Amino acid sequence: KSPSAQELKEQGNRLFVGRKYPEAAACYGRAITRNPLVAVYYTNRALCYLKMQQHEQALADCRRALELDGQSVKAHFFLGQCQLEMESYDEAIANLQRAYSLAKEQRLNFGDDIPSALRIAKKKRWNS
């Protein structure tokens, strides 16, 4: 009959890996419609918007995600990534450092992803 929020997040995830980013973001939006209290739907959609260069939309989604889950490592990382592409370097670095702390606190292991992003955040800032 109808897709559940879980079906739609699953569809969006497959579309995301398929580099179908606008279609993926619409699936996450439909998941939000069915349950607007899931931070992960918003951080997932934020990352689509990043891939689509719609940074202002990505910011908004990260901010909504932080209202729902203040501990979200990816909400902080995508926020830092977004502010980085917008030449907002001090805010980007702060958010990447905050993702790093939260990931350590939550025992998440993204390898060197967060330290690498921080090095680029500081390098790009210095080169500017």
Binding site: F110, D113, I114
Partner: peptide, 10 residues
Amino acid sequence: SSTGSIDMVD
């Protein structure tokens, strides 16, 4: 490659 990248949806 043993860790999934952070640049990915959940």
